[PDB]
Design a protein around this ligand. Structure first.
Ligand SMILES: CCc1cncnc1N1CCN(Cc2nc3cc(C(F)(F)F)ccc3[nH]2)CC1
Length: 316
């Protein structure tokens, strides 16, 4: 009758929220114990195929470490982690807010007032990650999600699906020519562009024809963008990594100091007091409204180290 064991049978599968090559994300209801009835996302990974690849294991382990060590309002919160013989289980907060760039489709385009807010929250998350010496690397629209209140939550610190996109990669990533944290500020620029124009800054016909447009780095500024937004984009989307904004020791502070964010109260923003442009309806805590419908039912289908000490219960 001591501390709760927290095995897979503590959760009821409600629905699929996404499938990948390495595993699945479910919406789950905890059915016994400390949060009996609360809704989580359950990420389930296949140990056997993770350990078949170094880079894959590296990402898994890193994530498991990041989500224990790094806790921030705009970063997904890990609640439990555990494992069985063949599977790894991560229990994160269920982010009923869905993807942010899913709104981009119904808006067509984000207004600068709106995009700013979300870029502002994202930047604060990126800034904290860098402070802990973590670079997020392959940042893309898919990764930005929203909580029940509609605030930004970064996610996907581990593996990829399929076993993705490349137009949000900085040039120095595609060249494989080494990269510092300045790589994440490019991604912010490319996300800003996507928000304010609908699609990525540079896009081609195929795998390598796309790369060429990114390497050449040609600014396609639409006239409706304000002076400041034009300036910030040409400062975030610089080819030369050293010349990029936020590349210097200023980092996030350097970015956040730009006139584009002149209206952001950072204290209130971080405290999540500023009302977000889009607050998603409720009608429940288990609402999957903006998680579209490729997903339904519920079914989960000796070198054990070192997922050794994988177990975790969040102190909160
Ligand atoms: C778990 C965080 C989350 C919380 N609440 C609601 N939605 C969420 N997500 C955020 C992540 N998102 C993308 C995604 N990453 C994946 C990784 C895998 C992998 F097993 F690694 F292969 C499988 C499916 C995946 N889908 C799915 C739904």
């Amino acid at each position: 009758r001591g501390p709760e064991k927290i095995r897979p049978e503590c959760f009821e599968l409600l629905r699929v929220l996404g499938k990948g090559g390495y595993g699945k994300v479910f919406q789950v209801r905890k059915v016994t114990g400390a949060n009996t009835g609360k809704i989580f996302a359950m990420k389930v990974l296949k140990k056997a195929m993770i350990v078949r690849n170094a880079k894959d294991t590296a990402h898994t382990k890193a994530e498991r470490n990041i989500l224990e060590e790094v806790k921030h309002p705009f970063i997904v919160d890990l609640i439990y982690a555990f494992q069985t013989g063949g599977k790894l289980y991560l229990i994160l907060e269920y982010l009923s807010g869905g993807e942010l760039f899913m709104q981009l489709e119904r808006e067509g385009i984000f207004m600068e007032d709106t995009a700013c807010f979300y870029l502002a929250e994202i930047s604060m998350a990126l800034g904290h990650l860098h402070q802990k010496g973590i670079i997020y690397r392959d940042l893309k629209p898919e990764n930005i999600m929203l909580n029940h209140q509609g605030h930004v939550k970064l996610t996907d610190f581990g593996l990829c699906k399929e076993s993705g996109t490349i137009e949000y990669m900085a040039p120095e990533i595609l060249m494989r020519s080494g990269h510092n944290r300045a790589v994440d500020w490019w991604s912010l620029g490319a996300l800003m562009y996507d928000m304010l124009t609908g699609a990525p800054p540079f896009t081609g016909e195929n795998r390598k024809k796309t790369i060429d447009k990114i390497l050449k780095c040609k600014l396609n500024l639409p006239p409706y963008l304000t002076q400041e937004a034009r300036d910030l984009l040409k400062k975030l989307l610089k080819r030369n990594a050293a010349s990029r904004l936020g590349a210097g020791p200023g980092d996030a502070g350097e970015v956040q100091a730009h006139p584009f964010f002149r209206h952001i109260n950072w204290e209130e923003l971080l405290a999540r007091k500023v009302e977000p442009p889009f607050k998603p309806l409720l009608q429940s805590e288990e609402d999957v409204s903006q998680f579209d419908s490729k997903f339904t039912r519920q079914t989960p289908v000796s070198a054990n180290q070192v997922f050794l000490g994988f177990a975790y219960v969040a102190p909160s």
